[PDB]
Structure formats: structure tokens, C-alpha cells
């Protein structure tokens, strides 16, 4: 009768046909990852091109339904996914050239290597060679060569490729009614047509900006502690007031201080929580770790897994002849068929990784009853943030003592809590301003505020101000450091890490309140609390059928990001960092560099 029946019947046609087509591509990917073969990788690509071709042809009728006079949120969200053209707006010459730029940038990044100036025959590749140099090796000379030469060999070559990448991408986004491809990344959290829950694209720039200033009181104190400890290892290059060198951060891109935990040990004499040996004595295995991990999900009050879940899942690498991808990855094969790929070992690192991947399944399994176009997460933060809150609570010794892995005689005090707590801030607090730094730089490059010749200059200036990091050797305009990152070269958005990190503590504080936990959040444990899982599943089941801002208002108590639950997690850490910074300077001074004279 009315025009509304067209969209309702059109989406029902797509939801029936797109469903089985997508599962064929999802299922072929499972076959390839379980058995790396020339046959499976081809069927994986063939199934992918088949489904993608169906998405393109369906866009014709999707654009025949204007959504101006439509008030149905369900009709608007589903059709908007297909009405967007994306890369189809440009000719085949520009779209193919963009793929030529991306594939070339990935190969230059993957095949990157640095050779020893004292031993040219010995050269280390990106993984596992150069990653170990920045992570494990404490030699000042080796870290400088791996950092500096990487920017000269890989960073310089990716500079002219990143230019066409930004230019070609901006034309695609601008044709799709955006300001730039930076704004295109900001459209993930876009909300419109819902009173009291709208959200503009540009509001993400102010949220990461506002939350960054609230992180500075915590980050500036940790940076002084890390600079002070690294100053003792490298006193001839690090000043007590100046900045930290970029090649001493712990990685080839300056994102995490997790590898610097051995140099920033708060108390080296006190013990820590580790149930790796405890599992070996109890005759545990990959299945029992996954099985006992499910008992946590059931005890908190979340749905259990199916029989085919554990039977059809992968627990180890089935030989070299049929070598599988050992990366932890949650899979949605469809029709209620959920599985996980992982080569699980008997160790606490895999104990929490098992809970991390199981949390991803609980995300997808919740909104599995939604329509196909709406059978997805509301945003990238909601997808990955829920996985960490389940593993962090499991990492609490309260859950380990209950299951029987950690002995009850294990002594807990404020001393050992700082060993655990400060280790996380090196990962969280030592990375939060870095993501805001990189995405702010990229967002300015997409808009065009920073010219192409001023990439390295503005990038170096931003490193001294935002994070307080200085390069080991000065770089001229021919360099391009952030182009050498995996996410930047492979066309990924890194802002999801910043939003995921803050959302992790927001959901944590919401469930810690549901679990009736008092005090800081780092001592929180939601085990055996049926109210914890019940409150979460009500949010997981929403999918992308409702605004993401609504999901936060009724759970964590806000609509945008916030630093409030962060200091509650690192509450005693701020005190500990203050006493340690008595013999140092909080913050940083941009005038100092390791090559100063």
C-alpha cells in the first residue's frame, strides 16, 4: 500500500539472501585458517567476491527509498549501509590505483628490515627480529638502529604512497557526503533521528580532546616515573626533566610501554599472580581451560555455549601439513554456529586470552536474533571493549582463588597490587595519549591542515607536546613515521583503540557496581555474581538496532567517553607515582633531546 512496505520487503529479501551468502564467505575463511591451502584460499576469495558483488547490485534499489520523511529507525539504519557507494563513486582507474597503493604499502611495511652497520650480512625482519630488538633487547645502540633505519628504509618509501592514499581516499569520502576520509572514520559513531541521542561526526574530535586533558594528570605522573627509571639505565642520554627518547618506548612504533615493565618494576622482591605452574600441576589442558572458562561466563549469569561450540572449535595446531592460524580469533560462521580458533597452551597468558575470545562470542551471540544488516555491533569500541572486562575480572586473584588455581595462602597487599596495577598503566596509560596523537595528526592530514611536506615536522612537534617523546636522530621532511604503522598502511582506524580503552573501564565500573564491589576497580571481581552477567547481556543484545549513546546512558552513566572510571582503576597508582616523582619532574620539557649538545 504505502512506500514503507518497499523497504520492509526489500530488506527482508536482502536479509534472506545476504545471510547465506555472507556465511559462505565466513565459512570459507574458517576452512582456510584451519588448513592453509591453495584450494581454501581461492574458495575464500571466490566466496568473498561473490558476496561483495551481491552488496553492489543490491545498492540500486536501496537508493530508491529516500529516508527524509521516514521516522522508522530500523528502516533508516539498514538501508543506509547499502545506499552508501564508498569506493564505487570514483572510476576504476582511481579505485584500482588505491588498491595498488595499499598493497604496495603493506608489502613495503611487511618486508621491512634493518641491517647491522657492524655486520651487514646479519639483517633482522619486521617479525620476530626487529620486534624483539625493541621489546627484549636493552642495548641502546641496537634499539637506535632498529628505530632510525626503519624510518629511513620503510618510513621514507611510504611517504609518497601515503600521499596518494590520502588524496584518493578524500575524493571517495567527499563523494559520499563527508568532509574528508578522516570524517569518514568518525561516521562510525554517527547518530541522527533519535531525540536525546543524536551524535555528530565532529563530536569525536572534542571527546578525545576533552578526555585527553583529563588523562594528563595521570599520564604526566607515569611519564616521569618511566623517564626516571629509564634515566637510570641510560643516564648519558636521558635527562631527569626532559623527554623520553622514541626508540626506548618498547616497540617499533611507540604505542605501548608494556615491554618496559622489566625496567620499571615497582618492587622487584615481591611476588605476583601467575597460575601457569598451578595449571600444570592440576593436569589442565586447552579444553579444560576453555571449559573452566565457560564456568565463569555461566556463574556471572551469561548464556552458555553449545555442544558444537567446543566440539568443532580448534585447540592446537593440527600438524605442519595442515598448519592452521594460531591467532586468537572469534568466528561467526552463522545459523547459530559459533567457534573459536586458538592454539591454547597451559599458561596464564592463554588463560585470559581464552576469556577474551569467549567475550567476543558473547557479544555476537547476544544480538544474533537481530536482522542480518543489524546483526553487528553498534561500534568498534563495543565490539572489543567487552572482551577485556571479562579477562580482567578473571585475572583478579579472587576468581583464581575460587576456582582453586591460586593458593589461598597467597599474600595480597598494597605492595604487590602496584606491581600488577602499574604494569597495566604501561599498556593503558602509556598508550591512551598516543592514539589521540596519531589520529589527531591523521585527521588533520585528511582535512588538509598539515601540508604533505610538513608531515614529519608537525609529527615531531606533536610528539614533544602531546606525549613528550623525542626522536633519537632528527628527521627532515622526506620522512613519514606514522605511515609505517600496520593500521595506517593497511587502511584501518586506530581511534577505536582509544575508545575501546576508555569504554573498557566504563563497562567495568558499571558491572563492578552491579557486583557490589567497593574500592578501586583493579581489585574488582564479578565472579559468582548473577547480576553481573544479567546487566551486561541486556546491552549486548541491542546490536546496532539502537543508538550506542543509549546503551551507555543506562549502563555506565554517560553518552560519550569519560576518564572518571580510569582514575578509579588507577586510584592508588596515582599516589605511588607521586612519591616516586619526588626526585624528578612531572610532565616533560620539549627543549631536551638525546642528540642535544
Amino acid at each position: 500500500s504505502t512506500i514503507e512496505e518497499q523497504a520492509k520487503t526489500f530488506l527482508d529479501k536482502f536479509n534472506h539472501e545476504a545471510e547465506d551468502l555472507f556465511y559462505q564467505s565466513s565459512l570459507a575463511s574458517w576452512n582456510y585458517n584451519t588448513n592453509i591451502t591453495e584450494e581454501n584460499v581461492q574458495n575464500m576469495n571466490n566466496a568473498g567476491d561473490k558476496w561483495s558483488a551481491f552488496l553492489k547490485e543490491q545498492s540500486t534499489l536501496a537508493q530508491m527509498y529516500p529516508l527524509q520523511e521516514i521516522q522508522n529507525l530500523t528502516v533508516k539504519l539498514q538501508l543506509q549501509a547499502l545506499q552508501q557507494n564508498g569506493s564505487s563513486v570514483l572510476s576504476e582507474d582511481k579505485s584500482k590505483r588505491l588498491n595498488t597503493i595499499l598493497n604496495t604499502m603493506s608489502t613495503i611495511y611487511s618486508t621491512g628490515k634493518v641491517c647491522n652497520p657492524d655486520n651487514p650480512q646479519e639483517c633482522l625482519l619486521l617479525e620476530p627480529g626487529l620486534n624483539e630488538i625493541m621489546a627484549n633487547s636493552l642495548d641502546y645502540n641496537e634499539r637506535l638502529w632498529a628505530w632510525e633505519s626503519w624510518r629511513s628504509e620503510v618510513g621514507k618509501q611510504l611517504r609518497p604512497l601515503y600521499e596518494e592514499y590520502v588524496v584518493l581516499k578524500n575524493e571517495m569520502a567527499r563523494a559520499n557526503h563527508y568532509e574528508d576520509y578522516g570524517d569518514y572514520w568518525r561516521g562510525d559513531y554517527e547518530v541522527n533521528g533519535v531525540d536525546g541521542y543524536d551524535y555528530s561526526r565532529g563530536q569525536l574530535i572534542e571527546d578525545v580532546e576533552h578526555t585527553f586533558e583529563e588523562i594528563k594528570p595521570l599520564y604526566e605522573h607515569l611519564h616521569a616515573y618511566v623517564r626516571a627509571k629509564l634515566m637510570n639505565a641510560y643516564p648519558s642520554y636521558i635527562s631527569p626533566i626532559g623527554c623520553l627518547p622514541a626508540h626506548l618506548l618498547g616497540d617499533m612504533w611507540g604505542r605501548f610501554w608494556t615491554n618496559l615493565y622489566s625496567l620499571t618494576v615497582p618492587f622487584g622482591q615481591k611476588p605476583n599472580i601467575d597460575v601457569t605452574d598451578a595449571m600444570v600441576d592440576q593436569a589442565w589442558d586447552a579444553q579444560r581451560i576453555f571449559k573452566e572458562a565457560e564456568k565463569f561466563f555461566v556463574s556471572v549469569g551469561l548464556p552458555n555455549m553449545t555442544q558444537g561450540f567446543w566440539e568443532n572449535s580448534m585447540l592446537t595446531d593440527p600438524g605442519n601439513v595442515q598448519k592452521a592460524v594460531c591467532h586468537p580469533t572469534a568466528w561467526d560462521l552463522g545459523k547459530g554456529d559459533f567457534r573459536i580458533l586458538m592454539c591454547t597452551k597451559v599458561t596464564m597468558d592463554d588463560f585470559l586470552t581464552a576469556h577474551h575470545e569467549m567475550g567476543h562470542i558473547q557479544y555476537d551471540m547476544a544480538y544474533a536474533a537481530q536482522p542480518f544488516l543489524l546483526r553487528n555491533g553498534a561500534n568498534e569500541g563495543f565490539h572489543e571493549a567487552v572482551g577485556e572486562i571479562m579477562s580482567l575480572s578473571a585475572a583478579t586473584p579472587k576468581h583464581l582463588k575460587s576456582i582453586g588455581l591460586l593458593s589461598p595462602d597467597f599474600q595480597e597487599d598494597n605492595e604487590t597490587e602496584i606491581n600488577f596495577l602499574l604494569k597495566q598503566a604501561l599498556t593503558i596509560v602509556g598508550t591512551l595519549p598516543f592514539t589521540y596523537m596519531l589520529e589527531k595528526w591523521r585527521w588533520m592530514v585528511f582535512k588538509g591542515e598539515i601540508p604533505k611536506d610538513q608531515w614529519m615536522k608537525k609529527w615531531w612537534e606533536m610528539k614533544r607536546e602531546i606525549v613528550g617523546v623525542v626522536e633519537p636522530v632528527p628527521h627532515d621532511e622526506t620522512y613519514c613515521d606514522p605511515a609505517s604503522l600496520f593500521h595506517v598502511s593497511n587502511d584501518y582506524s586506530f581511534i577505536r583503540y582509544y575508545t575501546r580503552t576508555l569504554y573498557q573501564f566504563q563497562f567495568q565500573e558499571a558491572l563492578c557496581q552491579a557486583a557490589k564491589h567497593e574500592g578501586p576497580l583493579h581489585k574488582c571481581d564479578i565472579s559468582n555474581s548473577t547480576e553481573a552477567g544479567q546487566k551486561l547481556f541486556n546491552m549486548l543484545r541491542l546490536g546496532k538496532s539502537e543508538p550506542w549513546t543509549l546503551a551507555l546512558e543506562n549502563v555506565v552513566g554517560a553518552k560519550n567517553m569519560n576518564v572518571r572510571p580510569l582514575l578509579n582503576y588507577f586510584e592508588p597508582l596515582f599516589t605511588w607515582l607521586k612519591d616516586q616523582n619526588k626526585n624528578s619532574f612531572v610532565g616533560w620539557s620539549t627543549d631536551w633531546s638525546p642528540y642535544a649538545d
Partner: protein, 194 residues
Amino acid sequence: VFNATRFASVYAWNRKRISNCVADYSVLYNSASFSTFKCYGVSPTKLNDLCFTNVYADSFVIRGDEVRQIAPGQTGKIADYNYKLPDDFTGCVIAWNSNNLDSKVGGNYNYRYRLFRKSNLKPFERDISTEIYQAGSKPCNGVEGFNCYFPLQSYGFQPTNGVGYQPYRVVVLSFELLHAPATVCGPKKSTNLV
């Protein structure tokens, strides 16, 4: 009908007549060869004490989640557009998972069903037409598209389906008490001759 080699489609649901015999309803209840079994108005163990004028068995295959639509007073794609039951339905429904029998690699396309219809069906009505569901004023001209849709679609009965999507061999046992005499009455007990 409970163990048929092939079942008719849902929109093309078949019907078999049962009369002029003795009907043991306790064998199915105690066979434990089903996934769900529910009778409306009467217990399954008591049907042997009751004869009826006519008894029909509507056979078809539906997904696990669609089993809820088969009951008096329900609505949905299967209840309204494929196979409807009356509000005063006092029969019985048996369901048996056939994932190991009817599932096929890539889906069993022989079992299909209607998603949309110009009007809702009546109780025990069937419609196997191929008319295009018209929503707008323009004619479809025998092809779907804008405000036009092909109403029939195939099922995705694959071996990897879940409990909510696997195939289930379902049969609806309806009873009828008319003015005509009985035709099928249950088995009576017997004992030795003293």
C-alpha cells in the same frame, strides 16, 4: 507421516487422512523419537480412550525457531502466510529434528516457504501460487523489484545450522467430532479368560 522419506514444502503442506483402523497414540509418546510433543485440550496418553470422526496429519518441515508459530492464536510468516491453525485447535503437534537426514551441503532447496502474501491465510488453508506480492500502485509485470517481491524462498537447511535453524520434521495431528459416526478408536486392553 512421522517417519516419511520426503516431506512436502510448508507453503505446499500435504495432508493425510486417518480413519477406519485402530490408532495407538501411546507409541509415539513413549517412543522418545521426537524433539517436541504437545497436545491441546487432551493428554497424549488419554487419546487411546477417544475416537473421532476424522483425523488428519499435516506434514511439513520447518526451522527450530519457527516451531513456536504452530499453535492456536499465533502469528508470523509461517502462521499467517504458509499454514494457519484455528484458535480452537484441540489437536496435537509432534516435532523431530532431521538435521542428520534432511540437511544438505549448501541448503536443501526442495523445502521452501512463503514470506509475504497479499492476505492472511485461513485455518487449514493452502496457497502454492507464484504471484508477485504487490505493495505499490505500479504493476510488477511478472518480476520483482521496487514495491514487488517474489513471495516464496528456499530454506537454508545446512548441516552446520544451529538448534534454531536446523530442519525439524513436524506433523500436526488434528481431530474432528462431526455428526457422522466414529471411524478410528484406540486399542482396548485385554486379559486372560477365567
